[PDB]
Design a protein around this ligand. Sequence first.
Ligand SMILES: O=C(O)Cc1c[nH]c2ccccc12
Ligand SMILES: O=C(O)Cc1c[nH]c2ccccc12
Ligand code: NA
Ligand code: NA
Lengths: 419, 419
Amino acid sequence: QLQARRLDGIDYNPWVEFVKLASEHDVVNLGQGFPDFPPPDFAVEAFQHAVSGDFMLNQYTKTFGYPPLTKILASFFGELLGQEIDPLRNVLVTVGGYGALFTAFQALVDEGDEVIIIEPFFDCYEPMTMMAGGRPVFVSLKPGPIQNGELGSSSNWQLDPMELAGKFTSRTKALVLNTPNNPLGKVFSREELELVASLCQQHDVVCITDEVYQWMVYDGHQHISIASLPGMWERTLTIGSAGKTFSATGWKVGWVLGPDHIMKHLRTVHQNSVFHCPTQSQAAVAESFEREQLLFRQPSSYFVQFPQAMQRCRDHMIRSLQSVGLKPIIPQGSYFLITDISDFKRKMPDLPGAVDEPYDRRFVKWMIKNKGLVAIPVSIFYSVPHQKHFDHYIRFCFVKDEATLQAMDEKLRKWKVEL
Amino acid sequence: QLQARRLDGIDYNPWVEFVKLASEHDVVNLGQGFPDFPPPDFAVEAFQHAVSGDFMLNQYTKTFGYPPLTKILASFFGELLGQEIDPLRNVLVTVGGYGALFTAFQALVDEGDEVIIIEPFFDCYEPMTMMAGGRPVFVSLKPGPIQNGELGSSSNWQLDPMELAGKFTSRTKALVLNTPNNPLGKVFSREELELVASLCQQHDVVCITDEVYQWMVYDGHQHISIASLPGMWERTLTIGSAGKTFSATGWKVGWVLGPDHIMKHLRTVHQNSVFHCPTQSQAAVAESFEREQLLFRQPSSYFVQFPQAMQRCRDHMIRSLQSVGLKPIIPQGSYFLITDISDFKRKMPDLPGAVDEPYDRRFVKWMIKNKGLVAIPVSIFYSVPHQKHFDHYIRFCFVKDEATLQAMDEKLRKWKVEL
Ligand SMILES: O=C(O)Cc1c[nH]c2ccccc12
Ligand SMILES: O=C(O)Cc1c[nH]c2ccccc12
Ligand code: NA
Ligand code: NA
């Protein structure tokens, strides 16, 4: 073989496929998990300052992070986590939340280890486990009963304690937690986190916690970081994304926070893979966090204003999608909501596609080509054996400009007449 | 073990002790392998434009590269290599030349594979081979004869054809070629490349070619890309660095060029590790290459002016360093020259050090502390078994501001005249 065996079974990527398909048709693109409006002025200005300031910012910075960035990460997140964070020993700056995940898997996961992943899961957790020689083990959130003409809530998708406990074994190396969850929008409760924490402590397992949507919480729901829970700092790696934090996904800056005895291994991966992150975007992100720490909890701060604005976009989309019979599950956080399409599957089962092909994939192609709306089939966030059973949801992104939502409504009005 | 075994023996960075010692003293830092002056105005302005233009440049771009960048990389390097290059199939944008290297090793190198590495080598080739489960196989360039009258030339460090041929086995997966070479500054001749090409073809080996210093060639020496040789495109990966190209090392943008049947595997690694490179730095790099393509081979082009300027810096450093008995080997390319310190070893054989610490490492420490000049011991660019023999060279970087070269001369004045 030319190629390494570690690449077995991970050459296909759904986003590569889906982005190509959407670009081939005239659509309102609610599949894109990023803003189509500008980042806040302070953030764009921060990047402008970084590229017009000290000329030496054009040259390499320190391997484990631009010092002003590690300093503010350690200060701000130390406060949030109720933890003393050493910028040199407990912070690593990475190429996005994505690179941070990769660094964690490559540092800790070895041949034969099991990694527990919670369905629905941000799809990369599976192939990253595989590339590191790990065996993915899946626990599935249980959609709650929906009654009295109500919409479901993401909060009511349950992490069953018996199910979760049954997935832990002597071979479990890590559990991957994503809260707020992409694609579902669930914000894990203290009780749910205590369940995860108790089992990670009992089995001596590391929790890799993907908290990129930390600030995107709605309806009074509170983000809780599992690393802040008793006994968890010493066994947790906490991941964030500047892009998802500051509505600047193209900046691709992320970080991992955690204890030195774990972090030293991620540093080893980092020094042997990218070595440096870009200097100037780090400077921009540091300046942006400084601004938010200064205004923390104040009504003028982005972390207060932006979630409030996006909650209005969420509510708008929830109302609109119902007009054509899609059934939203109300999210408590993230950029996303999912809609149940089971009524469509029942009444329009015979959409064309491959003999094995999940209904949601076929529905999304139908909707793009005939209705001019893009969504993401939720089955890509499920293990293959479960895709045939979770093929009746699709994911929309509501973090969009007013004009995009109006364009969405135009499409929905046309559909509604065609029902 | 908490950590994965792939990290075995790759946690140490032998640079670090020198960076730390340098920071503790009043030094002229000729160890840093990057400019201490600004990038050219057109490059800095390109980045400024990218962060103050289309607001959507703040969001994600395409996974395998920002299209305007892959477009110009394909056209510009297609011309240079005499090769039809498709942006989508044959170009991958990466996190620097370093990320490009990592991506190639992770795609291709597997347990039980051998990788041929040419000494002195850019130090990461060894641990990257190790992390991917490969066995590094080392072949040393051998300096040709030079008398007490004249200086050696990098061109005269020879790759013995029969030595090289004997390194090849049924297990050889890749050969890593770095031209122009860091630390030595050798520019491989057409003859030397034809030899490498012949053995790679005979044994069905992939040539990973690190060409970050492409533009930094001196004394009328020409950069030849091995991928341009007959039959080589189908078995070569060619790596470049925006940072080394535009004197903007903190930008950390690189690329790999190659045939689809190999590139698809690097795409698999990429999509499962970083997914996106940052958008705006890619826009800046595209704009910078457009500028240089327009002015290709013209007197006003950076690719003509800059290496001419740096040749003058090289010449200044070669003369200056001889004042204290250092013996430069004249480089034909790169940012670097090495000096033989054998005369110091003879006169001052006993220097403070650890057990089996190579003389050059002890000498650099002595020089930093006592003379205020930083260099890099060349033994870090050798396999451990060969460090005993190649213990008497140190690396200087001459890509420095005129003020820095003046400051070098002040340190040399003090070395000669004081005490
Ligand atoms: O959920 C999203 O839309 C964001 C997203 C999709 N594929 C990705 C790959 C890398 C980083 C983020 C994403
Ligand atoms: O040779 C140099 O000084 C440049 C250099 C040393 N270590 C490095 C790691 C990544 C990228 C560049 C370098
Ligand atoms: Na255990
Ligand atoms: Na062979």
